[PDB]
Tab-separated table of C-alpha atoms and ligand atoms in Angstrom:
chain	number	residue	atom	x	y	z
A	22	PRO	CA	66.614	69.085	27.838
A	23	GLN	CA	68.908	71.596	26.149
A	24	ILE	CA	72.585	70.591	26.260
A	25	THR	CA	75.647	72.832	25.614
A	26	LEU	CA	78.859	71.494	24.078
A	27	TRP	CA	81.645	72.395	26.562
A	28	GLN	CA	81.545	68.739	27.655
A	29	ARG	CA	81.200	65.671	25.402
A	30	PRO	CA	77.376	65.099	25.092
A	31	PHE	CA	77.176	61.690	26.902
A	32	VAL	CA	73.706	60.403	27.979
A	33	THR	CA	72.754	57.275	29.954
A	34	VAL	CA	71.230	54.636	27.733
A	35	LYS	CA	69.598	51.263	28.431
A	36	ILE	CA	69.597	48.541	25.823
A	37	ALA	CA	68.416	44.970	26.429
A	38	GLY	CA	68.665	45.320	30.191
A	39	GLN	CA	72.235	46.791	29.992
A	40	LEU	CA	73.183	50.346	31.045
A	41	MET	CA	75.862	52.496	29.378
A	42	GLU	CA	76.803	56.062	28.459
A	43	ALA	CA	76.681	57.039	24.792
A	44	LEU	CA	77.643	60.086	22.795
A	45	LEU	CA	74.906	62.133	21.075
A	46	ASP	CA	76.651	62.285	17.759
A	47	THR	CA	75.262	64.519	14.985
A	48	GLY	CA	78.234	63.559	12.760
A	49	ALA	CA	77.211	59.876	12.806
A	50	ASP	CA	74.663	58.335	10.402
A	51	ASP	CA	74.422	55.196	12.492
A	52	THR	CA	74.471	54.062	16.098
A	53	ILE	CA	77.468	52.020	17.182
A	54	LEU	CA	78.100	50.259	20.493
A	55	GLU	CA	81.273	48.896	22.110
A	56	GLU	CA	82.518	45.373	21.270
A	57	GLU	CA	81.588	44.009	24.725
A	58	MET	CA	77.897	44.706	24.007
A	59	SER	CA	76.058	41.389	23.909
A	60	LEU	CA	72.860	41.595	21.821
A	61	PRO	CA	70.702	38.523	21.059
A	62	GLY	CA	69.430	37.523	17.583
A	63	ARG	CA	70.516	37.336	13.947
A	64	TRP	CA	72.718	40.007	12.370
A	65	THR	CA	74.152	40.901	8.988
A	66	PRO	CA	77.914	41.586	8.522
A	67	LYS	CA	78.705	45.196	7.680
A	68	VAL	CA	81.706	47.535	7.687
A	69	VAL	CA	81.622	51.209	8.778
A	70	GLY	CA	84.014	53.991	7.730
A	71	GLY	CA	85.492	56.906	9.632
A	72	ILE	CA	88.623	58.786	10.611
A	73	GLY	CA	91.399	56.194	10.519
A	74	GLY	CA	89.671	53.943	8.038
A	75	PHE	CA	87.117	51.178	8.274
A	76	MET	CA	85.891	48.738	10.883
A	77	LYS	CA	83.875	45.529	10.802
A	78	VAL	CA	80.520	45.472	12.673
A	79	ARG	CA	77.428	43.334	13.416
A	80	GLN	CA	74.214	44.966	12.244
A	81	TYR	CA	71.224	44.360	14.562
A	82	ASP	CA	67.812	45.521	13.329
A	83	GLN	CA	64.819	46.619	15.423
A	84	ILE	CA	66.585	47.043	18.765
A	85	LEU	CA	64.842	48.924	21.558
A	86	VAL	CA	67.036	51.698	23.008
A	87	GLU	CA	66.052	53.814	26.012
A	88	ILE	CA	67.853	57.206	25.674
A	89	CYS	CA	67.196	59.612	28.603
A	90	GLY	CA	63.988	57.539	29.202
A	91	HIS	CA	62.658	58.138	25.648
A	92	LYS	CA	62.020	54.770	23.953
A	93	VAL	CA	63.278	54.398	20.385
A	94	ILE	CA	63.667	51.460	18.004
A	95	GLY	CA	66.187	51.101	15.243
A	96	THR	CA	69.274	49.483	13.848
A	97	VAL	CA	72.259	49.283	16.190
A	98	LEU	CA	75.807	48.387	15.048
A	99	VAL	CA	78.171	46.525	17.376
A	100	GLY	CA	81.948	46.519	17.033
A	101	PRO	CA	85.308	47.724	18.309
A	102	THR	CA	84.369	51.455	18.468
A	103	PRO	CA	86.225	53.639	21.034
A	104	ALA	CA	82.900	55.147	22.194
A	105	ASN	CA	79.254	54.249	22.281
A	106	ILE	CA	77.721	56.512	19.588
A	107	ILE	CA	74.060	57.472	19.058
A	108	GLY	CA	73.750	58.459	15.385
A	109	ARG	CA	71.086	60.349	13.446
A	110	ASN	CA	69.012	57.155	12.932
A	111	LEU	CA	68.133	57.268	16.648
A	112	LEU	CA	68.616	60.990	17.257
A	113	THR	CA	65.728	61.750	14.868
A	114	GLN	CA	63.407	59.559	16.998
A	115	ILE	CA	64.019	61.636	20.153
A	116	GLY	CA	63.276	64.903	18.265
A	117	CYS	CA	66.926	65.938	18.536
A	118	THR	CA	67.888	69.233	16.854
A	119	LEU	CA	71.004	71.401	16.674
A	120	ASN	CA	70.451	75.059	17.698
A	121	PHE	CA	72.692	78.125	17.214
B	7	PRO	CA	68.840	78.452	12.965
B	8	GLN	CA	67.222	75.297	14.353
B	9	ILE	CA	68.298	72.204	12.392
B	10	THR	CA	66.773	68.672	12.426
B	11	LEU	CA	68.787	65.517	11.808
B	12	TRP	CA	66.974	63.628	8.991
B	13	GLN	CA	69.874	64.738	6.803
B	14	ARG	CA	73.592	65.182	7.635
B	15	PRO	CA	74.030	68.669	9.268
B	16	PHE	CA	76.384	70.283	6.678
B	17	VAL	CA	76.933	74.070	6.736
B	18	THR	CA	78.881	76.321	4.370
B	19	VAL	CA	82.115	77.528	5.917
B	20	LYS	CA	84.746	80.009	4.796
B	21	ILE	CA	88.317	79.526	5.936
B	22	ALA	CA	91.188	81.665	4.594
B	23	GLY	CA	89.246	82.735	1.501
B	24	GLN	CA	88.256	79.126	0.632
B	25	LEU	CA	84.659	77.838	0.754
B	26	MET	CA	83.628	74.318	1.775
B	27	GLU	CA	80.810	72.393	3.426
B	28	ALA	CA	81.437	70.961	6.904
B	29	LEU	CA	79.579	68.609	9.217
B	30	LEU	CA	78.303	70.074	12.523
B	31	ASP	CA	79.672	67.261	14.619
B	32	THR	CA	78.785	66.992	18.337
B	33	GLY	CA	80.768	63.710	18.581
B	34	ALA	CA	84.010	65.478	17.588
B	35	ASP	CA	86.222	67.256	20.134
B	36	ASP	CA	88.243	68.798	17.359
B	37	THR	CA	87.642	70.404	13.967
B	38	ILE	CA	89.266	68.576	11.020
B	39	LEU	CA	89.424	69.522	7.311
B	40	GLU	CA	90.074	67.515	4.128
B	41	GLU	CA	93.671	66.810	3.035
B	42	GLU	CA	93.639	69.375	0.160
B	43	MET	CA	92.900	72.346	2.436
B	44	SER	CA	95.854	74.726	2.164
B	45	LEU	CA	96.444	76.633	5.409
B	46	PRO	CA	99.356	79.061	5.835
B	47	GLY	CA	101.813	79.146	8.737
B	48	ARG	CA	103.606	76.793	11.083
B	49	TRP	CA	101.997	73.723	12.639
B	50	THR	CA	102.711	70.876	15.023
B	51	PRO	CA	102.408	67.125	14.237
B	52	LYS	CA	99.468	65.440	15.905
B	53	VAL	CA	97.522	62.235	15.450
B	54	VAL	CA	93.711	61.913	15.876
B	55	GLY	CA	91.720	58.795	16.801
B	56	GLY	CA	88.374	57.444	15.653
B	57	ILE	CA	86.432	54.554	14.184
B	58	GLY	CA	88.995	52.567	12.199
B	59	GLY	CA	92.057	53.708	14.104
B	60	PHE	CA	94.271	56.768	13.941
B	61	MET	CA	95.281	59.349	11.358
B	62	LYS	CA	98.116	61.883	11.158
B	63	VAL	CA	97.179	65.597	11.023
B	64	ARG	CA	98.700	69.118	10.940
B	65	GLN	CA	97.559	71.252	13.863
B	66	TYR	CA	97.031	74.952	13.033
B	67	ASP	CA	96.252	77.353	15.893
B	68	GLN	CA	94.137	80.518	15.868
B	69	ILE	CA	92.535	80.026	12.441
B	70	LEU	CA	89.607	82.279	11.507
B	71	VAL	CA	86.600	80.196	10.493
B	72	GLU	CA	83.350	81.676	9.229
B	73	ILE	CA	80.519	79.213	9.963
B	74	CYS	CA	77.038	80.171	8.667
B	75	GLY	CA	78.509	83.726	8.879
B	76	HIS	CA	79.441	83.592	12.610
B	77	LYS	CA	83.100	84.468	12.969
B	78	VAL	CA	85.023	82.087	15.227
B	79	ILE	CA	88.724	81.397	15.871
B	80	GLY	CA	90.226	78.129	16.981
B	81	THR	CA	92.526	75.256	16.342
B	82	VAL	CA	91.785	73.513	13.040
B	83	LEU	CA	93.344	70.126	12.140
B	84	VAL	CA	94.068	69.249	8.502
B	85	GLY	CA	94.471	65.661	7.301
B	86	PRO	CA	93.059	62.821	5.200
B	87	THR	CA	89.560	62.957	6.778
B	88	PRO	CA	86.628	61.674	4.657
B	89	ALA	CA	84.534	64.711	5.724
B	90	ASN	CA	85.143	68.274	6.804
B	91	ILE	CA	84.171	68.225	10.503
B	92	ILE	CA	83.319	71.105	12.852
B	93	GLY	CA	83.987	69.887	16.380
B	94	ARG	CA	82.939	71.173	19.803
B	95	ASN	CA	85.987	73.503	20.013
B	96	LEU	CA	84.250	75.675	17.347
B	97	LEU	CA	80.637	74.627	18.058
B	98	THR	CA	80.753	76.209	21.550
B	99	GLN	CA	81.762	79.513	19.923
B	100	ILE	CA	78.617	79.674	17.776
B	101	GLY	CA	76.411	78.974	20.838
B	102	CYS	CA	75.532	75.536	19.459
B	103	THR	CA	73.313	73.372	21.655
B	104	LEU	CA	71.620	70.001	21.306
B	105	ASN	CA	67.885	70.007	21.996
B	106	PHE	CA	65.481	67.095	22.540
C	15	LIG	C1	91.523	55.277	18.655
C	15	LIG	C2	90.662	55.723	19.836
C	15	LIG	O1	90.616	57.131	19.848
C	15	LIG	P1	89.456	57.958	20.632
C	15	LIG	O2	90.133	59.403	21.006
C	15	LIG	C3	88.034	58.258	19.488
C	15	LIG	O3	86.732	57.954	20.047
C	15	LIG	C4	85.767	58.390	19.190
C	15	LIG	C5	85.728	57.926	17.880
C	15	LIG	C6	84.756	58.376	16.986
C	15	LIG	C7	83.815	59.304	17.402
C	15	LIG	C8	82.735	59.809	16.434
C	15	LIG	C9	83.345	60.563	15.241
C	15	LIG	N1	84.209	61.613	15.772
C	15	LIG	C10	85.487	61.745	15.441
C	15	LIG	O4	86.068	61.002	14.651
C	15	LIG	O5	86.132	62.799	16.007
C	15	LIG	C11	87.557	62.810	15.918
C	15	LIG	C12	87.913	64.268	15.821
C	15	LIG	O6	87.771	64.789	17.164
C	15	LIG	C13	88.177	63.726	18.078
C	15	LIG	O7	87.154	63.552	19.102
C	15	LIG	C14	87.159	62.140	19.413
C	15	LIG	C15	87.252	61.479	18.046
C	15	LIG	C16	88.169	62.419	17.260
C	15	LIG	C17	82.288	61.233	14.357
C	15	LIG	O8	81.460	62.048	15.184
C	15	LIG	C18	81.396	60.233	13.630
C	15	LIG	N2	82.033	59.663	12.428
C	15	LIG	C19	83.339	60.273	12.153
C	15	LIG	C20	83.226	61.236	10.984
C	15	LIG	C21	82.942	60.508	9.681
C	15	LIG	C22	82.116	62.229	11.266
C	15	LIG	S1	82.233	58.067	12.671
C	15	LIG	O9	82.361	57.790	14.142
C	15	LIG	O10	83.476	57.604	11.958
C	15	LIG	C23	80.831	57.224	12.003
C	15	LIG	C24	79.743	56.905	12.810
C	15	LIG	C25	78.637	56.262	12.267
C	15	LIG	C26	78.615	55.930	10.917
C	15	LIG	O11	77.531	55.297	10.402
C	15	LIG	C27	77.873	54.475	9.285
C	15	LIG	C28	79.697	56.245	10.101
C	15	LIG	C29	80.800	56.891	10.648
C	15	LIG	C30	83.850	59.765	18.715
C	15	LIG	C31	84.816	59.314	19.605
C	15	LIG	O12	88.942	57.302	21.993
C	15	LIG	C32	88.325	58.167	22.957
C	15	LIG	C33	88.053	57.419	24.263
């Protein structure tokens, strides 16, 4: 699909049996999910930086994400983000481009 | 142009005679510029929220921004952001879409 930007670009996403809306975020290197997200497995501690400073996150590798039905696999970060965010690591896998 | 997302989507912008690179940022409602940007005129205090918390910014209305040569006008926020950010308030004015 082609999506305009008068509304926040939320899509429905399915990760490990859970459903959620997430922001298609061209300004984000990495994908980050809300703190209530429960993902199984090992993870490595990491910290992510943004507007307002830094925040601590769990890094989960090789997670299957279904974004508008497209299946993608990549690293997902979990932590106290205000919004589920799909970053360029996953956006590249769905052939996402900016057009203007 | 059509732009892929294997690299951060920076464009060259020109704002009140100054040049800078700014991130085309679909996850941003608002446009924000680095703390050293000098904009003339009055402004109103505002605070912006993100990953890591909140930050204080100056809100300047009706600023002329030249983005890849498109002329647009909108509210620009200035404050201690780690990256110049073009948000959907200006992205909609350059006919910017997401495509996948
Ligand atoms: C305190 C709660 O306030 P909030 O209003 C903010 O909810 C957010 C937060 C962050 C983002 C993504 C970033 N946009 C954003 O900050 O926008 C600002 C300006 O406009 C406003 O729109 C909502 C957020 C304001 C931006 O697109 C991505 N990076 C920021 C910047 C460095 C580009 S990032 O999120 O810090 C990031 C992601 C992945 C990374 O990989 C390592 C690194 C960094 C979206 C929504 O809650 C709403 C319910």
